[PDB]
Design a protein around this motif. Structure first.
Motif, PDB file in Angstrom:
ATOM      1  N   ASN A  64       0.819  -1.219   0.000  1.00  0.00           N
ATOM      2  CA  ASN A  64       0.000   0.000   0.000  1.00  0.00           C
ATOM      3  C   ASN A  64       0.855   1.272   0.000  1.00  0.00           C
ATOM      4  N   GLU A  65       1.637   1.412  -1.066  1.00  0.00           N
ATOM      5  CA  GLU A  65       2.705   2.408  -1.153  1.00  0.00           C
ATOM      6  C   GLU A  65       2.179   3.826  -1.372  1.00  0.00           C
ATOM      7  N   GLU A  66       1.064   3.935  -2.089  1.00  0.00           N
ATOM      8  CA  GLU A  66       0.551   5.232  -2.531  1.00  0.00           C
ATOM      9  C   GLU A  66      -0.504   5.833  -1.592  1.00  0.00           C
ATOM     10  N   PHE A  67      -0.854   5.106  -0.532  1.00  0.00           N
ATOM     11  CA  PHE A  67      -1.776   5.601   0.494  1.00  0.00           C
ATOM     12  C   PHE A  67      -0.988   5.824   1.790  1.00  0.00           C
ATOM     13  N   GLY A  68       0.071   6.627   1.689  1.00  0.00           N
ATOM     14  CA  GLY A  68       1.139   6.674   2.690  1.00  0.00           C
ATOM     15  C   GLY A  68       0.797   7.035   4.128  1.00  0.00           C
TER      16      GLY A  68
END
Ligand SMILES: [C-]#[N+][C@@H]1[C@@H]2c3c([nH]c4ccccc34)C(C)(C)[C@H]2CC[C@@]1(C)CC
Ligand SMILES: O=C(O)CCC(=O)C(=O)O
Ligand SMILES: [Fe+2]
Length: 267
Positions: A64-68
């Protein structure tokens, strides 16, 4: 008004209608069950994850890289889904080494607290749902405040009378932080309709939380302790992890069947 019990895993058979009491009667809102799994097994499973000999669980890790920052890394697909479910159940089976087994121990707890049969939901043509997922909160990470309200959906036809509980057991806990905070502020579809988008509604929820207009209980279960609470009804969050050691939990949801003749648990 929020009310929780705090019992040992041995005491579960003193409470055969606990899941009914929370969901249907709403006489209390959650409970902590101490030492559902042993410290040995929790550390054993954590080692298998850290070392990499995890029965192929790393293959289904969603970073879940882009919902930091205010989300967790998660082993398995939370509700392609049916694939990861099979890999998880196998992987989980491997690590726990039936000492005791995850599914058998957990189902025993839900059965002791209900007196009903406990099963993992099934797909249209026999595909198993994942009973749980593993959530990984590293240093500096948290889980933003939320409510676990309502595939869209085969599950609905098995379930829904009519609150869903959330459950989890920590495999590892952090030094500081990583605390479940549960608020008395509830999900209300009439409050949400007042705003044009959920962005605006969650900003007011956040305001109501930070203004301390609600009661809030905080829990930090130790490795092997189960937290079982009404996550679909009440807003809640996991606080920011402090220190190098990650918070690792294995958790999901549960609910009564359509007829209240079963209890289903999944993630
Ligand atoms: C963490 N986490 C999960 C939920 C989740 C959220 N946002 C996400 C974005 C991308 C992937 C997962 C999530 C919220 C804040 C609803 C998280 C609630 C807790 C979850 C473990 C639920 C399956
Ligand atoms: O910490 C976890 O594993 C999830 C906490 C949560 O939001 C839940 O159990 O519903
Ligand atoms: Fe939740």
């Amino acid at each position: 008004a929020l009310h929780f019990l705090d019992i040992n895993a041995t005491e579960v058979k003193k409470y055969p209608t606990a899941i009914q009491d929370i969901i249907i009667n709403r006489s209390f809102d959650g409970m902590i069950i101490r030492g559902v799994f042993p410290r040995d097994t929790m550390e054993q499973v954590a080692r298998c994850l850290e070392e990499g000999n995890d029965g192929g669980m790393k293959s289904i890790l969603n970073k879940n890289e882009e919902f930091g920052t205010k989300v967790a890394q998660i082993y398995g697909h939370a509700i392609d889904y049916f694939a990861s479910s099979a890999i998880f159940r196998q992987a989980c089976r491997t690590m726990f080494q039936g000492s005791p087994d995850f599914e058998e121990q957990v189902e025993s707890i839900f059965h002791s607290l209900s007196g009903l049969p406990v099963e993992i939901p099934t797909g249209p043509e026999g595909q198993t749902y994942t009973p749980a997922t593993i959530r990984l909160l590293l240093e500096g990470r948290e889980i933003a405040v939320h409510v676990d309200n309502d595939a869209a959906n085969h599950l609905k036809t098995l379930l829904d009378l009519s609150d869903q509980l959330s459950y989890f057991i920590p495999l590892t806990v952090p030094e500081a932080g990583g605390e479940l905070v549960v608020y008395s502020l509830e999900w209300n579809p009439q409050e949400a309709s007042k705003y044009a988008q959920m962005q605006e509604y969650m900003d007011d929820v956040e305001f109501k939380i930070k203004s301390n207009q609600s009661q809030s209980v905080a829990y930090a279960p130790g490795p092997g302790d189960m937290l079982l609470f009404n996550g679909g009804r009440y807003y809640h969050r996991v606080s920011e992890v402090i220190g190098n050691s990650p918070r690792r939990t294995i958790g999901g949801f549960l609910a009564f069947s359509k007829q209240r003749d079963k209890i289903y648990y999944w993630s």
